[PDB]
């Protein structure tokens, strides 16, 4: 089959900013949150590589908020406007699941500058 591979290419984005797990994305979002449409500024670090395409959940985690707060929006969805990607990380993993078994003050994500 080919048409099942083309059906996703009319809802996926064709040119976008480049990002990887550990990057600061500064997502501007709508996410409903009331009856009239309004733009909010979401903070945190992206924990997604989104290579699987249309259904990639675009997971973001703010470790600077209390114990750490986590949310999803999807990579190709109508609830997100644009990402800045001005600041970018330098990590050695792509899933980052250790943030779900280690205390935040011992799991702060490394900058590893030389």
């Amino acid at each position: 089959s080919n048409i099942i591979k083309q059906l996703e290419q009319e809802q996926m984005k064709q040119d976008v900013p480049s990002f990887r797990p550990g990057d600061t994305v500064e997502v501007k979002v709508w996410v409903v949150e009331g009856s009239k449409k309004r733009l909010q500024a979401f903070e945190g670090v992206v924990i997604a590589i989104r290579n699987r395409g249309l259904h990639s959940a675009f997971t973001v985690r703010k470790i600077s908020n209390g114990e750490g707060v986590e949310r999803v929006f999807q990579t190709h969805s109508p609830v997100v406007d644009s990402i800045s990607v001005k600041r970018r990380g330098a990590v050695r993993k792509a899933k980052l699941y250790y943030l779900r078994e280690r205390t935040g003050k011992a799991a702060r994500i490394k900058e590893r500058l030389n």
Binding site: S1, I3, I4
Partner: protein
Amino acid sequence: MIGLVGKKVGMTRIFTEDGVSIPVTVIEVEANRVTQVKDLANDGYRAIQVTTGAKKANRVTKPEAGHFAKAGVEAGRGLWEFRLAEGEEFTVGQSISVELFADVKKVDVTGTSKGKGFAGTVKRWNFRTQDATHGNSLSHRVPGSIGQNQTPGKVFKGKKMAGQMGNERVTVQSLDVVRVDAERNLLLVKGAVPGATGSDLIVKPAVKA
């Protein structure tokens, strides 16, 4: 009125705004080529043999080749005969496409389900397992006590037993169509339909009261 034979190519989701995911099954339906129409100097009932396929020129056999020869030089692998109701068909007209669903978007689907070999005694028949310890051993997934003492004193029909399973016909009556494309041979339906990817099925416009 009639039915179409297709090819189930997978499942996905197409969403709504701002959310709700709308899971959809993806089917390809190459236009059904037609082989025969009855009550036209052949048989006492109104019916069409819709056909899909062609087979291979050095593998096709004489009793099949000579059965399609009235309609052409390709053995269309099957007939799929449907009786006519609330409509008409003739021996001239375009090969039957998904334009059958251009305005009638509620359908019913027939096909074989769960083609998964033997499964297992508990994985098929949804039994309750025995104790894994507390002195119990050797029995855990065996079918159990198959009857009761003397008076009925026999094994019942309509009970649960092991064997070769699956690949038997199921009919689905509550389905809505999301999109069709006759130029790209596409059918998109809301939810799921019986059998794995590669399944042929039958899809029909709804006649349920």
